[PDB]
Coordinates of C-alpha atoms in Angstrom, one line a residue:
Chain A
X1 CA 16.1 5.4 -7.6
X2 CA 14.9 3.0 -4.2
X3 CA 14.4 -0.2 -2.8
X4 CA 11.0 -1.6 -3.7
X5 CA 9.2 -0.8 -6.7
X6 CA 5.0 -1.4 -8.4
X7 CA 3.6 -2.4 -11.4
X8 CA 1.6 1.2 -12.8
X9 CA -1.5 -0.2 -14.4
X10 CA -0.3 1.5 -18.0
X11 CA 2.5 0.0 -17.4
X12 CA 5.3 1.9 -16.1
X13 CA 7.7 1.4 -12.7
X14 CA 6.6 3.2 -10.2
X15 CA 9.8 2.7 -8.3
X16 CA 9.6 3.9 -4.5
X17 CA 12.5 6.1 -3.5
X18 CA 12.8 4.7 -0.6
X19 CA 15.4 2.7 1.1
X20 CA 13.7 -0.5 3.2
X21 CA 14.5 -4.1 3.9
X22 CA 12.8 -6.0 2.2
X23 CA 10.5 -8.7 4.7
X24 CA 8.5 -12.1 2.8
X25 CA 5.1 -9.7 3.6
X26 CA 5.7 -7.7 1.1
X27 CA 5.9 -11.1 -0.7
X28 CA 2.4 -10.8 -1.5
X29 CA 1.7 -7.0 -2.0
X30 CA 2.4 -5.4 -4.7
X31 CA 6.1 -3.9 -4.8
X32 CA 9.2 -6.0 -6.1
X33 CA 13.0 -6.3 -5.3
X34 CA 15.1 -3.3 -6.7
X35 CA 17.7 -5.3 -8.0
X36 CA 15.9 -7.9 -10.2
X37 CA 14.1 -5.0 -12.1
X38 CA 16.5 -4.8 -15.2
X39 CA 16.1 -1.5 -15.6
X40 CA 18.9 0.1 -16.4
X41 CA 19.6 3.7 -14.4
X42 CA 22.2 6.4 -15.1
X43 CA 25.4 6.0 -12.7
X44 CA 25.3 2.4 -11.6
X45 CA 25.6 0.5 -14.5
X46 CA 27.6 -1.8 -12.4
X47 CA 25.4 -3.2 -9.8
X48 CA 22.5 -3.5 -13.0
Chain B
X1 CA 46.6 18.0 6.0
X2 CA 46.3 18.4 9.5
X3 CA 43.1 20.0 9.9
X4 CA 41.7 17.6 7.5
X5 CA 42.2 15.1 10.1
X6 CA 41.2 17.2 12.8
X7 CA 37.9 17.1 11.2
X8 CA 37.5 14.0 12.2
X9 CA 37.7 14.8 15.9
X10 CA 33.9 16.3 15.7
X11 CA 31.1 15.2 17.6
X12 CA 28.7 13.7 15.9
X13 CA 25.5 14.8 18.8
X14 CA 22.8 16.8 19.1
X15 CA 21.7 19.2 21.7
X16 CA 19.3 18.8 24.3
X17 CA 17.3 21.4 26.6
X18 CA 16.7 19.7 30.1
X19 CA 12.7 19.8 29.7
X20 CA 11.8 17.0 32.2
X21 CA 14.2 18.7 34.4
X22 CA 12.8 22.8 34.1
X23 CA 9.4 22.1 34.2
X24 CA 10.5 19.2 37.6
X25 CA 11.6 23.2 38.7
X26 CA 15.0 21.2 39.1
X27 CA 18.1 23.0 40.5
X28 CA 20.2 24.5 37.3
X29 CA 23.4 26.1 37.1
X30 CA 22.8 28.3 33.6
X31 CA 19.8 29.9 32.0
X32 CA 19.1 27.2 28.9
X33 CA 19.6 24.6 30.6
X34 CA 21.4 22.0 27.6
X35 CA 23.8 19.4 27.5
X36 CA 25.2 17.2 24.6
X37 CA 23.9 13.5 23.8
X38 CA 26.4 12.1 21.4
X39 CA 24.5 10.2 19.5
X40 CA 20.4 10.3 18.2
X41 CA 18.6 8.1 18.0
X42 CA 17.9 6.1 14.7
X43 CA 14.9 3.8 13.9
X44 CA 13.8 2.2 11.2
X45 CA 17.4 2.9 9.1
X46 CA 19.2 0.0 7.2
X47 CA 22.5 2.3 6.7
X48 CA 23.0 3.3 10.6
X49 CA 24.1 6.9 9.3
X50 CA 25.6 7.2 13.3
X51 CA 28.1 4.0 11.9
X52 CA 28.1 5.6 8.3
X53 CA 30.6 8.5 10.2
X54 CA 32.9 5.7 11.5
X55 CA 33.2 5.1 7.1
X56 CA 34.4 7.6 6.3
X57 CA 37.4 8.1 9.1
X58 CA 38.8 4.8 8.5
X59 CA 38.7 5.7 4.6
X60 CA 40.7 9.1 5.3
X61 CA 42.7 7.1 8.3
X62 CA 43.5 4.8 5.4
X63 CA 45.1 7.3 3.6
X64 CA 47.0 8.8 6.4
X65 CA 48.5 5.2 7.2
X66 CA 49.5 4.6 3.7
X67 CA 51.0 7.5 2.7
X68 CA 53.3 6.8 5.8
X69 CA 54.1 3.1 4.6
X70 CA 54.9 4.0 0.7
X71 CA 57.3 7.0 1.8
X72 CA 59.1 3.9 3.5
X73 CA 59.1 1.0 1.4
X74 CA 57.1 -1.2 3.8
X75 CA 55.9 -4.5 2.3
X76 CA 52.6 -5.9 0.8
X77 CA 51.8 -7.8 3.3
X78 CA 53.0 -5.7 6.5
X79 CA 50.5 -2.9 4.9
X80 CA 47.8 -5.2 3.6
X81 CA 47.4 -6.6 7.1
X82 CA 47.0 -2.9 8.4
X83 CA 43.5 -2.6 6.0
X84 CA 42.1 -5.0 7.1
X85 CA 42.2 -4.3 10.3
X86 CA 40.9 -1.4 9.8
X87 CA 38.1 -2.7 8.3
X88 CA 37.9 -5.1 11.0
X89 CA 37.1 -2.2 12.9
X90 CA 34.0 -1.7 9.8
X91 CA 32.7 -4.2 10.6
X92 CA 32.6 -4.7 14.4
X93 CA 31.0 -1.1 15.2
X94 CA 28.2 -2.1 12.5
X95 CA 27.4 -4.4 15.1
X96 CA 27.3 -1.8 18.0
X97 CA 26.3 1.1 16.7
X98 CA 22.6 -0.4 16.5
Chain C
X1 CA -32.8 -48.3 1.8
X2 CA -33.3 -45.4 4.0
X3 CA -32.4 -47.5 6.9
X4 CA -31.0 -46.7 10.2
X5 CA -27.1 -46.8 9.3
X6 CA -28.0 -43.4 8.0
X7 CA -29.7 -41.8 11.0
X8 CA -33.5 -41.5 9.7
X9 CA -35.7 -43.6 11.7
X10 CA -39.1 -44.4 9.7
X11 CA -41.2 -45.1 12.3
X12 CA -43.6 -42.9 12.7
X13 CA -44.8 -42.3 8.9
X14 CA -42.1 -39.2 8.1
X15 CA -38.2 -39.0 7.7
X16 CA -36.7 -37.8 11.0
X17 CA -33.3 -37.3 11.7
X18 CA -31.9 -36.4 16.6
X19 CA -29.5 -33.9 16.5
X20 CA -29.1 -32.4 12.5
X21 CA -30.7 -28.6 12.9
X22 CA -32.2 -28.5 17.1
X23 CA -33.5 -25.6 17.5
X24 CA -31.3 -23.5 21.1
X25 CA -33.0 -21.4 23.4
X26 CA -35.8 -23.6 24.3
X27 CA -37.5 -26.5 26.3
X28 CA -35.3 -29.5 25.9
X29 CA -38.8 -31.9 24.5
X30 CA -39.5 -29.0 21.4
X31 CA -36.8 -30.1 19.2
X32 CA -38.5 -32.9 17.6
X33 CA -40.6 -30.9 14.9
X34 CA -36.9 -29.9 13.3
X35 CA -36.2 -33.6 12.5
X36 CA -39.0 -33.7 10.1
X37 CA -36.6 -30.4 7.8
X38 CA -33.7 -31.9 8.7
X39 CA -35.8 -36.0 8.0
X40 CA -36.1 -34.3 4.7
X41 CA -32.3 -33.3 4.2
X42 CA -30.8 -36.9 4.7
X43 CA -33.2 -38.0 2.7
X44 CA -32.3 -35.2 -0.5
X45 CA -28.6 -36.3 0.9
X46 CA -29.3 -39.8 0.3
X47 CA -30.6 -39.1 -2.9
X48 CA -28.0 -36.9 -4.3
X49 CA -25.8 -39.0 -3.4
Chain D
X1 CA 3.5 -45.2 -7.6
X2 CA 2.8 -41.6 -8.1
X3 CA -0.4 -42.2 -10.0
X4 CA -2.0 -44.0 -6.7
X5 CA -0.6 -41.3 -4.4
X6 CA -2.0 -38.6 -6.3
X7 CA -5.5 -39.7 -7.3
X8 CA -5.7 -41.0 -3.9
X9 CA -5.7 -37.2 -2.3
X10 CA -7.3 -35.7 -5.6
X11 CA -9.9 -38.6 -3.9
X12 CA -10.4 -38.2 -0.5
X13 CA -10.1 -34.2 -0.3
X14 CA -13.1 -33.1 -3.2
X15 CA -15.6 -36.0 -0.8
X16 CA -14.2 -33.8 2.5
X17 CA -15.6 -31.1 1.7
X18 CA -19.3 -33.1 0.6
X19 CA -21.0 -32.4 3.9
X20 CA -19.5 -28.7 3.9
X21 CA -21.3 -28.4 0.5
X22 CA -25.5 -29.6 1.3
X23 CA -25.7 -27.6 4.1
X24 CA -24.5 -24.7 2.3
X25 CA -26.3 -25.3 -1.6
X26 CA -29.6 -25.6 1.1
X27 CA -28.7 -22.1 2.9
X28 CA -27.2 -20.4 0.2
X29 CA -30.7 -17.9 -0.3
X30 CA -31.1 -17.8 3.9
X31 CA -29.0 -14.4 4.4
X32 CA -31.4 -11.5 4.6
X33 CA -32.1 -7.4 4.5
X34 CA -34.3 -5.5 6.9
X35 CA -36.2 -3.3 3.6
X36 CA -39.7 -0.7 4.5
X37 CA -42.5 -0.7 3.0
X38 CA -43.8 3.0 2.6
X39 CA -47.7 2.9 1.3
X40 CA -48.2 4.8 -1.7
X41 CA -51.9 5.6 -2.4
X42 CA -55.0 4.4 -0.2
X43 CA -56.3 0.9 1.9
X44 CA -53.1 -0.8 0.4
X45 CA -51.5 -3.9 2.1
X46 CA -48.2 -4.4 4.5
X47 CA -45.9 -5.5 1.1
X48 CA -47.7 -3.5 -1.7
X49 CA -45.5 0.1 -2.1
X50 CA -41.6 1.2 -2.9
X51 CA -39.4 -1.0 -0.8
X52 CA -36.4 0.6 0.4
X53 CA -33.2 -0.1 2.4
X54 CA -30.7 1.1 3.5
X55 CA -26.8 2.1 2.2
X56 CA -25.2 -0.2 5.7
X57 CA -28.3 -2.8 4.8
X58 CA -27.2 -2.5 0.9
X59 CA -23.2 -2.5 1.1
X60 CA -23.0 -5.6 3.7
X61 CA -25.6 -7.9 2.0
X62 CA -25.7 -6.8 -1.3
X63 CA -23.1 -4.8 -3.2
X64 CA -20.7 -7.7 -2.1
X65 CA -23.1 -9.9 -4.3
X66 CA -23.0 -7.9 -7.3
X67 CA -18.8 -7.3 -7.7
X68 CA -19.5 -11.6 -7.3
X69 CA -22.2 -11.8 -9.8
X70 CA -20.1 -10.1 -12.9
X71 CA -22.9 -7.0 -13.7
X72 CA -22.1 -2.9 -13.9
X73 CA -22.9 -0.8 -10.8
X74 CA -26.5 0.1 -10.6
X75 CA -27.5 3.5 -11.3
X76 CA -27.8 7.1 -9.3
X77 CA -31.6 8.0 -8.7
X78 CA -31.8 11.9 -9.3
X79 CA -35.0 13.2 -9.0
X80 CA -34.7 14.3 -13.1
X81 CA -34.3 9.6 -14.6
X82 CA -37.3 8.8 -16.2
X83 CA -38.6 5.3 -15.7
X84 CA -37.2 4.5 -19.1
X85 CA -33.4 4.9 -16.7
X86 CA -34.5 2.6 -13.5
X87 CA -35.3 0.1 -16.6
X88 CA -32.2 0.6 -18.2
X89 CA -30.9 -0.7 -14.9
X90 CA -33.2 -3.3 -13.8
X91 CA -32.4 -5.2 -17.4
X92 CA -28.6 -4.2 -16.9
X93 CA -28.2 -5.5 -13.2
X94 CA -29.9 -8.3 -13.4
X95 CA -31.3 -7.1 -10.0
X96 CA -33.8 -4.5 -9.7
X97 CA -32.0 -2.3 -7.2
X98 CA -30.8 2.0 -7.3
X99 CA -29.3 3.8 -5.4
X100 CA -30.7 7.9 -4.4
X101 CA -28.4 10.1 -4.3
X102 CA -30.3 13.4 -4.3
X103 CA -33.7 15.6 -5.3
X104 CA -36.9 14.9 -5.4
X105 CA -37.8 11.7 -7.7
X106 CA -40.5 12.2 -9.6
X107 CA -44.0 10.8 -10.3
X108 CA -43.5 9.8 -13.0
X109 CA -40.5 7.0 -11.9
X110 CA -42.8 6.5 -8.5
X111 CA -45.6 4.7 -10.7
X112 CA -42.4 2.2 -11.8
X113 CA -40.8 2.3 -8.4
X114 CA -44.4 0.7 -7.0
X115 CA -45.1 -1.9 -10.5
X116 CA -41.7 -3.8 -10.6
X117 CA -41.3 -3.9 -6.9
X118 CA -37.7 -2.1 -7.2
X119 CA -35.6 -1.5 -3.8
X120 CA -34.3 1.8 -3.5
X121 CA -31.5 2.4 -1.5
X122 CA -31.8 5.1 1.0
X123 CA -28.1 6.4 2.1
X124 CA -30.7 7.5 5.8
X125 CA -34.1 6.9 6.8
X126 CA -33.9 10.4 7.9
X127 CA -37.5 12.3 6.3
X128 CA -37.7 10.1 4.2
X129 CA -40.9 11.4 2.6
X130 CA -39.6 14.7 1.5
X131 CA -37.5 12.9 -0.7
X132 CA -40.5 11.8 -3.0
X133 CA -42.6 13.7 -4.8
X134 CA -45.4 12.6 -3.3
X135 CA -48.3 14.3 -5.5
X136 CA -50.6 11.4 -4.3
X137 CA -50.2 13.2 -0.6
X138 CA -51.4 9.4 1.0
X139 CA -47.2 8.6 1.6
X140 CA -47.0 9.4 5.4
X141 CA -43.3 8.9 7.7
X142 CA -44.9 6.7 10.0
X143 CA -46.6 4.5 7.3
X144 CA -44.9 1.3 6.9
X145 CA -44.3 -2.5 7.5
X146 CA -40.2 -3.3 9.0
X147 CA -40.1 -6.7 7.2
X148 CA -37.1 -8.7 6.6
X149 CA -36.1 -9.8 2.4
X150 CA -34.5 -13.2 1.8
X151 CA -31.3 -12.6 -0.8
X152 CA -33.4 -15.8 -2.6
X153 CA -36.6 -13.2 -3.8
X154 CA -33.7 -11.4 -5.3
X155 CA -31.3 -13.4 -6.8
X156 CA -31.9 -15.4 -9.0
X157 CA -29.1 -18.0 -10.9
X158 CA -28.4 -21.7 -11.7
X159 CA -25.5 -21.9 -9.4
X160 CA -24.8 -19.2 -7.3
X161 CA -28.3 -19.0 -4.7
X162 CA -30.6 -22.2 -4.3
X163 CA -34.1 -20.7 -4.8
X164 CA -36.5 -23.2 -6.8
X165 CA -39.8 -24.1 -4.8
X166 CA -38.7 -26.9 -3.3
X167 CA -35.4 -25.6 -1.3
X168 CA -38.2 -22.6 -0.9
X169 CA -40.4 -24.3 1.6
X170 CA -37.7 -25.8 4.0
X171 CA -36.1 -22.4 4.7
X172 CA -40.0 -21.7 5.8
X173 CA -39.7 -25.5 7.7
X174 CA -36.0 -24.5 9.3
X175 CA -36.0 -22.5 12.6
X176 CA -34.3 -19.7 13.2
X177 CA -30.8 -20.7 12.8
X178 CA -27.2 -19.5 13.8
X179 CA -23.4 -20.2 12.7
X180 CA -23.0 -22.9 15.5
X181 CA -26.6 -24.7 14.9
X182 CA -25.2 -24.9 10.9
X183 CA -21.8 -26.4 12.2
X184 CA -23.6 -28.7 14.5
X185 CA -25.3 -29.7 10.9
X186 CA -21.8 -30.7 9.7
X187 CA -20.8 -32.5 11.8
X188 CA -23.8 -34.5 12.2
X189 CA -23.9 -35.9 8.4
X190 CA -20.5 -36.0 9.0
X191 CA -20.7 -38.7 11.5
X192 CA -23.6 -40.6 9.1
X193 CA -21.5 -40.9 6.2
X194 CA -18.3 -41.5 7.1
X195 CA -16.5 -41.9 3.6
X196 CA -14.4 -44.0 2.1
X197 CA -10.4 -44.2 2.5
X198 CA -7.5 -46.5 1.1
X199 CA -4.6 -46.9 2.8
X200 CA -3.0 -43.6 1.3
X201 CA -6.2 -41.5 2.4
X202 CA -5.7 -42.4 5.9
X203 CA -2.0 -41.3 6.4
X204 CA -3.7 -38.3 4.6
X205 CA -5.8 -36.9 7.0
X206 CA -4.2 -37.7 9.6
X207 CA -1.1 -35.3 8.3
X208 CA -3.4 -32.2 8.0
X209 CA -5.7 -33.2 10.2
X210 CA -8.0 -31.4 11.8
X211 CA -9.4 -27.8 11.7
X212 CA -12.4 -27.2 9.1
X213 CA -14.8 -24.9 11.3
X214 CA -12.8 -21.7 10.4
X215 CA -14.1 -20.5 7.2
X216 CA -18.0 -19.6 6.1
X217 CA -18.8 -20.8 3.2
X218 CA -22.3 -18.9 2.9
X219 CA -22.4 -17.6 -1.2
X220 CA -18.3 -19.2 -1.1
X221 CA -16.3 -18.8 -4.5
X222 CA -13.2 -19.0 -6.1
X223 CA -11.9 -15.4 -7.2
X224 CA -8.9 -13.7 -7.9
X225 CA -7.4 -10.5 -5.2
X226 CA -5.3 -7.6 -6.1
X227 CA -2.6 -6.8 -4.6
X228 CA -3.8 -4.3 -2.7
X229 CA -6.0 -6.7 -0.4
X230 CA -9.2 -6.2 -2.4
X231 CA -11.5 -8.5 -4.2
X232 CA -11.8 -8.0 -8.4
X233 CA -14.9 -9.3 -10.7
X234 CA -14.1 -12.6 -12.7
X235 CA -13.3 -11.7 -15.6
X236 CA -13.6 -14.3 -18.4
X237 CA -10.1 -13.8 -20.1
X238 CA -7.5 -14.5 -17.0
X239 CA -9.4 -17.1 -14.6
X240 CA -10.8 -20.4 -15.9
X241 CA -14.1 -21.0 -16.4
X242 CA -14.4 -23.6 -13.9
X243 CA -13.5 -20.7 -11.5
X244 CA -16.7 -18.5 -12.7
Chain E
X1 CA 48.2 -23.7 1.2
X2 CA 48.7 -20.9 3.6
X3 CA 47.4 -17.8 2.1
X4 CA 44.1 -19.0 0.7
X5 CA 43.3 -19.7 4.5
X6 CA 41.0 -16.8 5.2
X7 CA 38.9 -17.9 1.4
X8 CA 39.1 -21.6 2.8
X9 CA 37.3 -20.6 5.6
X10 CA 34.3 -19.9 4.3
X11 CA 33.7 -22.4 2.2
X12 CA 34.0 -25.0 4.5
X13 CA 31.9 -22.6 7.4
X14 CA 29.0 -21.8 4.4
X15 CA 29.5 -25.4 2.9
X16 CA 29.3 -26.6 5.9
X17 CA 25.7 -26.2 6.5
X18 CA 23.4 -27.1 4.4
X19 CA 21.9 -30.6 5.1
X20 CA 21.9 -33.4 2.6
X21 CA 19.4 -34.6 1.4
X22 CA 17.3 -31.3 1.4
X23 CA 19.9 -31.8 -2.0
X24 CA 16.9 -34.1 -2.6
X25 CA 14.0 -32.6 -1.2
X26 CA 15.1 -29.4 -2.5
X27 CA 14.2 -30.7 -6.4
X28 CA 10.7 -31.0 -5.3
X29 CA 10.5 -27.4 -4.8
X30 CA 11.4 -26.8 -8.1
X31 CA 8.0 -27.7 -9.8
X32 CA 5.7 -28.1 -6.5
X33 CA 2.6 -25.6 -5.7
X34 CA 3.3 -23.1 -3.4
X35 CA 0.8 -22.3 -0.3
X36 CA 2.5 -21.0 2.4
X37 CA 5.1 -18.4 1.5
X38 CA 8.6 -19.6 1.1
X39 CA 11.6 -17.5 3.2
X40 CA 15.0 -17.7 3.4
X41 CA 17.7 -19.3 5.8
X42 CA 19.7 -16.3 7.4
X43 CA 22.7 -15.7 6.2
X44 CA 24.4 -13.5 8.0
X45 CA 27.6 -12.0 6.5
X46 CA 28.9 -7.9 6.8
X47 CA 30.9 -8.4 3.3
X48 CA 34.5 -7.1 4.9
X49 CA 37.1 -9.7 3.4
Chain F
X1 CA 20.1 -34.4 -20.1
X2 CA 19.2 -36.3 -16.9
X3 CA 17.7 -33.4 -14.9
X4 CA 15.8 -32.0 -17.0
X5 CA 13.6 -34.7 -18.1
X6 CA 12.7 -35.3 -14.9
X7 CA 11.5 -31.7 -14.4
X8 CA 10.0 -32.1 -17.7
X9 CA 7.7 -35.2 -16.5
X10 CA 7.2 -33.9 -12.0
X11 CA 5.5 -30.6 -14.7
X12 CA 2.9 -32.7 -15.6
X13 CA 1.5 -34.6 -12.5
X14 CA -1.6 -34.7 -10.7
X15 CA -1.6 -31.9 -8.0
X16 CA 1.3 -30.1 -9.1
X17 CA -1.5 -27.7 -10.2
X18 CA -0.1 -24.1 -10.1
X19 CA 2.5 -22.1 -13.1
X20 CA 5.6 -22.1 -11.0
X21 CA 7.8 -19.2 -12.4
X22 CA 7.5 -17.1 -16.6
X23 CA 11.3 -16.4 -17.8
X24 CA 11.3 -12.6 -16.1
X25 CA 12.0 -12.5 -12.5
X26 CA 10.6 -8.3 -13.3
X27 CA 7.4 -8.9 -13.3
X28 CA 6.3 -12.3 -12.4
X29 CA 3.9 -12.7 -9.4
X30 CA 1.6 -16.2 -8.5
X31 CA -2.0 -15.2 -8.5
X32 CA -3.3 -15.1 -6.0
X33 CA -7.1 -16.8 -4.8
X34 CA -8.9 -16.4 -1.6
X35 CA -12.1 -17.8 -1.2
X36 CA -14.1 -15.2 -0.8
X37 CA -17.3 -15.0 0.9
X38 CA -20.5 -11.8 1.4
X39 CA -21.0 -13.3 5.2
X40 CA -17.7 -13.5 5.9
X41 CA -13.8 -12.8 5.6
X42 CA -12.1 -14.0 3.0
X43 CA -9.1 -16.9 3.4
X44 CA -6.2 -16.6 0.7
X45 CA -4.8 -19.8 -0.9
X46 CA -0.9 -18.4 -1.0
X47 CA -0.6 -16.5 2.4
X48 CA 2.8 -16.5 5.0
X49 CA 1.2 -17.6 7.7

């Protein structure tokens, strides 16, 4: 699904689909941490 | 099973031509001078794709040493200290595969 | 009121401040005409404060 | 113990940008663009005519100040534009600025652009007379007066650009300024008026404590930005009223 | 206890650093403004055992 | 019982003037105000430096 996700202006979660390490320079930007999305995904319900 | 364990000795490399040696017009003893570099450069990756090969080798070797252990009903403690060591080679391989 | 504490020199009739808006790139004695303009600022600044 | 430590910070920094604020209130309209004035008929002045500036000049000075004053974008006059439509852009965007796109602007709108002094923004000074329907045939490619146009001459707000009759005189008496002379003017008023401070107030100013002269304060406002990195316009429903 | 020596070497090992009284400081971080972006003290772990 | 009433009164102080959290980790970001200027570069408030 992705390691970062952005907020679409209509309100949907646009997951990036890339495996990247987080840095705190991305804290000011539009990307979020994907573990804290609280969005259930099929098959990975234990990580959620 | 014997063929399956011999699929763990396979190399994890690529086949690079001698691009800087042919253009330098150096002596070579073949038609296409190609050497075998053991592992690809791994820039920008979170999970290292060469260290993850050793994850899947030990996961097969921890099933070979488990079936050999329970065939001779050895201790739970003497088997657990083997598999703790087999994943201590997991951790020490991640430090150097970078 | 516009005493020597605020750097306004009312001796010559007009307010004069020495080193507030000096013009650059001129002869070293040609900055006196810009003192009246800086003098009107510190009069405006003192009424405002 | 915490009230007197909170007041003595809010007292100090309220007067710390006090000489920062005074000079930039006087010079809030000191910025200027380079316009041209193409004369249109026989025996005109240097300033009577169509007032025109470039898109590269528009994008720096004028466009960044229309996204602050929260107006729509000015319209693209395309040659088929009636002078009612240009009046719909002066009444929407409170400055008389219109953008050019293409076409040949007719002489009906050319009489409108002369009387109301509407600033026409061109993308280039490349064959300028051919873009107008020169029916009177007095407008020439080499007939203009490239003069400056200050920002206070085209804008007027109560709390954004100080442009009254008094400050209009003082910028005419000031010499040719710079970003090194305005920085000298702030360091001189800070030398004259040494501010008051309590026992806790001096402890904060020697803690921060020296760098002030980095940020420009010309028409400085408080706005939000996107996480992209672009400055958003003001919104009546998201920001507090004190930031408008 | 001997069998929990693998556990107590990771609790003490974590426990030993965090400073006191940074505990007093932190509580002030749960309601201060943020002007510099905070960042995590580097916890280099392996998640082996 | 005793930490919570300290957070309820430290959040009413004068200089703690920003909202800090809004319940959900999934959407909250601090509002990034800047000091914009048409004659210079904007300087952000919340800025990792």
